[PDB]
Amino acid sequence: RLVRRVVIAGGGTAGWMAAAALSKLLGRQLQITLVESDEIGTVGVGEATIPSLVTFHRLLEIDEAQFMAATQATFKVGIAFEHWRDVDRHYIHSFGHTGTDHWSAGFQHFWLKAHARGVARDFGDYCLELRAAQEGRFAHLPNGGMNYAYHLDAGLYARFLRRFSEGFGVQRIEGRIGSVQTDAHSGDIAALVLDDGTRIEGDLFLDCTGFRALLIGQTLGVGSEDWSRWLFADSALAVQTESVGAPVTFTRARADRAGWMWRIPLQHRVGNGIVYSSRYTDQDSAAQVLEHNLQGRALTTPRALRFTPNQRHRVWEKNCVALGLASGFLEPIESTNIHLIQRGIVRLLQTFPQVIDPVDIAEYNRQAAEEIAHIRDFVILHYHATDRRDTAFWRDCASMEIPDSLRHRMELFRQSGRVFHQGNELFAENSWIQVMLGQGIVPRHHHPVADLMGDAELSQFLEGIRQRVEATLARLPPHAEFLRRYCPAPAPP
Amino acid sequence: PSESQRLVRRVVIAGGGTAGWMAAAALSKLLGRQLQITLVESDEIGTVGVGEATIPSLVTFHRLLEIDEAQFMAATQATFKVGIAFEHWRDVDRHYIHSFGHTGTDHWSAGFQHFWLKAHARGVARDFGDYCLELRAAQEGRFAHLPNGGMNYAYHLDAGLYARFLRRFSEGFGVQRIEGRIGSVQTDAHSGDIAALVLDDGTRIEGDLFLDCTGFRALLIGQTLGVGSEDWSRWLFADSALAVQTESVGAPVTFTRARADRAGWMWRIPLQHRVGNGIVYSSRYTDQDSAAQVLEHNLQGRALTTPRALRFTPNQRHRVWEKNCVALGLASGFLEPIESTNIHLIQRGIVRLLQTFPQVIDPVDIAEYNRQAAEEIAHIRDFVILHYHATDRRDTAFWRDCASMEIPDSLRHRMELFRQSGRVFHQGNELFAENSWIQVMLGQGIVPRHHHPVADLMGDAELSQFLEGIRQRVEATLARLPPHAEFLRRYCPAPAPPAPMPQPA
């Protein structure tokens, strides 16, 4: 049966990112219908992103400045990780690349040798994007020389994508789903039945219904793998504050006693939140910690969220593809939520069915499983690589068993300073290095190629890199000045 | 134990030839100022006049080593290679080319083959090969470099001359060559590590890290350390070859020929002043005398050598790095030369070693090395199996068995993906690109039942205009390339041997 009708269950970022991409590419031959309820809204929730979204908008021919102005967006070049290695020990995990590699050995080997010889500055001084986070500067550079992403209002983003999608013929139906129907012989989803009795028939259904996974889970019975043995957070509180100064170019991830706090700058507001574990603390205490750390007064009543670190066992089952929370969830410590939605959509478009076949489904599921396990391991790394023993939460994080896949990467770096990137893993070599060095893993050896340079040659190699970083950084304007010239957003009412 | 005693300062390479001298060359180039590197080889071991085909990774190897391409080619009687002509694989008298490069133009949502498949269903497609420049250069016998690596290519070379060229390079970076035969291998009583080699004259060569380049003898990784190998003969039946050089009968073509027969296949490889030939076959399906007759029947020109008989078996060493020993080349495994992977697998073992080169040897480094090696070779294994399993042939028991055998699940999934939806993917550092999977599966008769629906957006005129614009760009580029022989004469002319010995007909 030819796939001619796609029904998207749920709106928000997952549903409207899917509608936007599907209608842009295939909307001239597909009937695309999205069902969502006006009773759900996310406007005024700030969210951080990663550079894959730049590519997504290139594929969709979305104008960056128009998108940013419509979503109150600012630029992002990294995440400032405060108090993770230990209290008062901070580092930045930035985009980009540090230093110059040799074909046999990455830059970190030269930096490690130089540091042992006392001729190295901080590892981050050799990375432009990291310095741009420290100094609050941003502009685009020729030939994609600046690696960046965005801080955005997720509700305004969904609204922008809705306008885009409706322009490519997406049919929006306002309502709630009262029943999901299956086919008696195949087990496929046949239709959704709305709360007014309307049956919406389709060939392929996207489950964007959130954490309940109404289609792939409650209807088709696909369970999820629970990761709470490794990842203890299960709660969040979020609140916006007034801006108190020019927008920084980084997201802040500030560890506390039993969780951590995000701070995300938008053009005229700041998004804040605390992520914590209900098995170690309670909502009242977390609200107190969040309030204590806010700059400026809160503008909204805090919004509470409950979640589980998890992954749907298969993200494509029969004629249903899950996206967003219905496919899984990891806390926003590395800003991966919108990325995982995008990956599910782009992979679906690259495997789009003429007819649906098990071999396509199996390949899709294999890729999704591999990609998410890699991101999970990197999230676990943030909690497990810590010197902190000051609360039960941190002692438990440091002492837990971890996936063998993560243990092997940590051991490789600890022994020989080596990191290796595979396939379509999200996190690049630079990310593994910045985070492991930043959180206190010290390689016992470095690559022998770095020992070929004497002290003066090695010091000059590093210093040349650092001078080029500083010379480039000096040409970049303050963030707020660039925003004003490139993508000024209207002041909220 | 002593920690300082763990530092790797002395590297001993057991065996010469391609494996040993490629290893010596790369290791001495990069680390010869810090390591004492010794290579042990016997003058009684080795064969003169082996012609071998390669793949584009060797171009990168020479860039890493700063080996000049024209000097290397002139020194090894080398010619250029843009692909392999596969004759009689899909069926008797049905041929195709597996080239380097990429066919057509992709969309971000769908590879070129989906547009070609739609065009074929609409009757507006030419042969798939017409949309690939390297393939057309194979058909027309043309070659030159193009700006920004616009031509993808590798080499046909004399392997013995290549090893001698690398020996000269290596000695220049300080490698110490010791001629002789290894009489025994000494191990450490407590660790089992290799401690030294002892030659037949009593010479003791100590080292910290040992590279086993001894071939099927596997003196270190096999005979000493006892690492077994995985048997792949349930999927791959060839175990024998006969090889012979012939005089050139014309200008050198730009492709390696892989011509299937009843129970094996034959290679034909052009060098600047001779041609390499061989038949690869299964002793379980035919005998040497019959294989010799088939080879003789297909030869062009007089033979320049007496045919040499070879034995082998498809396999991978269970671990290629064991304790302080790294196996390379035949000691690490073997696949038949159907996709010209022998020298590539040596290079990968060397490059991977240099990228994880030990200050001290540690199990986590060994484990990572072995994992990468195992994943890479299994992927190449599957592609070799694909050549035998994807066939219409039922005309001999050999082909019926190849078509009906069980295959690895990893290969079955790739074949089913293409058969159902025309889809291919490339993962990690797998050798074979999407273009390779597509050309070989289409060429050997896997017919996609569906294609990506994005191609259904194009009407016939738009689709034909898309394909014809690609074909016109291929043909305009091809018309600017000279005949292979003219390019060789100007770029890398090798001296003609003075006294070849053609045998009377």
Numbering used by the authors:
A (entry chain B): 11 to 503
B (entry chain A): 6 to 510
From the manuscript:
Flavin-dependent halogenases regioselectively introduce halide substituents into electron-rich substrates under mild reaction conditions.
This can be explained by the lack of stabilization of tryptophan in the substrate-binding site. The FAD-binding loop (amino acids 47–56) of Xcc4156 does not have continuous electron density in chain B. Indeed, the loop is partly disordered in one chain of the apo structure and is fixed in an open conformation in the other chain. The FAD-binding loop, which changes its conformation between the apo and the FAD-bound form in related enzymes, is involved in a crystal contact in the apo Xcc4156 crystals. The asparagine in Xcc4156 is particularly interesting as its side chain occupies the position that would be taken up by the ribityl moiety of FAD in a FAD-bound halogenase, thus possibly hampering FAD binding.
